[PDB]
Amino acid sequence: MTQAEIKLCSLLLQEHFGEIVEKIGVHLIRTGSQPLRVIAHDTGTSLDQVKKALCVLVQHNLVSYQVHKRGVVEYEAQCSRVLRMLRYPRYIYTTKTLYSDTGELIVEELLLNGKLTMSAVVKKVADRLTETTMDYAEVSNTFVRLADTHFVQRCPSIPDDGIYWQANLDRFHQHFRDQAIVSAVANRMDQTSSEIVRTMLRMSEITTSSPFTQPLSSNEIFRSLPVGYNISKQVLDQYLTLLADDPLEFVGKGMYVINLHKALASLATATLESVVQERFGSRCARIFRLVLQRTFYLYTVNILSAARMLLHRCYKSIANLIERRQFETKENKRLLEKSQRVEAIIASMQLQEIEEMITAPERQQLETLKRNVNKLDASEIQVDETIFLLESYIECTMK
């Protein structure tokens, strides 16, 4: 919806799917919801290339479709959903964190392969865990836990009416939001204070996420606490300290509430401070801290516009990271092709003379590239962690 995000979508769509898919994808992003003939005409693409490109995009949950007026299907792509391709490593990891390699592989399969039936996922995962015997029933049980906890959901309703599975991104997001609030409350408070916020966020998963938590009572919060030795008097002292606290994650009016917008507001600002410390230094990070709670172009306590433009800078840097990775990998096209071919000979199996095909300076270059690629990969994940926080905060500031 801005050139920064549209350049990013373009890059992702081509890296993952190539020329025509990028062409059709970017088009539906730029020009909006429209039928096949128009896409074909407006893009100067053959009606079958459009048909195929849309199939790949639908398969990958990147393009949705709808029947309007009479029998006329209009295709639509969401710029945001394409940028979520950058968050896939986090979704997959978060799953492993909660469920085993079973959870990890289910979400990896659904995210990377696209639309799959519960059957196709269970089969694909069991085989994958067997090659490292995997009981398909345990795979199926993990899938059911994911679906019950809404981390995984059926695609909206050929027109194959709910027979396919999709990872629920809105669920991973509220989890990331809740995870962040708790961690903030743990690093600035008491851990017993963070656990109280956690259960409060856990039980208020009902009446979320469309500024403030659903009002919760002291009596029910006590009953909903996990299996851990704690008296009602101790907990009541903790809600009271949560109420009267500097970050302002609570207000109450026993009935207690979590100030979700202030929670995101303070997460956003702390992320701004980190950029100040990395770009300007520790001496300059101390100056720009007191101005919060002009030497360099910004305004006194301007929360939104700073985050709103830091997001723009995040989209630009992620786009720069991708371009550099493509550049590094293109400048070594011949060598990594030699590396690929050398790997193929060893797989068919003496071995030492086949390895020798790659010279020591060539292996020094392949390792430097692997190190550099892993470095750019890691930055991309780390920048998206900032993107999530800025986006969430900015989305919450649309009340």
We report the CATH number of the domain holding residue 1 as 1.10.10.10
Locate 372 and state its tokens: 């550099």
Q: Does 244 lie in the same domain as 182?
A: yes
Resolution (A): 3.0
Phi/psi-derived region of residue 159, left when phi > 0, alpha when psi is between -120 and 50, beta in every other case: left
DSSP output for 174-186 = HHHHHHHHHHHHH
- Domain of 237? 168-259
CB 115 within 8 A of CB 165: yes
**CA-to-CA separations, 246 to 50, 69, 143, 263, 396, in angstroms, rounded:** 56, 55, 42, 11, 21
Beta bridge partners of 67: 73
Residue 165 one-letter amino acid: W
C-alpha–C-alpha distance, residues 247 and 395, integer Å: 20
What technique determined this structure?
A: X-ray
Q: Does 312 lie in the same domain as 398?
A: yes
Indicate which CATH number applies to the domain containing 315.
6.10.140.1450
Backbone angles phi, psi at 171, to 5 degrees: -70, -45
**CA-to-CA separations, 309 to 129, 235, 254, 287, 332, in angstroms, rounded:** 44, 41, 41, 20, 35
DSSP output for 307-369 = HHHHHHHHHHHHHHHHHHHHHHHHTTHHHHHHHHHHHHHHHT--HHHHHTTS-HHHHHHHHHH
Number of H helices and E strands in the chain, helices first, is 19, 7
CA 18 to chain CA mean position, Å: 22
Residue 313 one-letter amino acid: R
Q: Does 308 lie in the same domain as 255?
A: no
DSSP output for 50-80 = HHHHHHHHHHTTSEEEEEETTTEEEEEE-HH
C-alpha–C-alpha distance, residues 266 and 113, integer Å: 37
Which DSSP helix (H) or strand (E) runs through 19?
helix 19-30
Tokens 């959870």 -> residue: 103
> How many other CB atoms sit within 10 Å of the CB of residue 345?
13
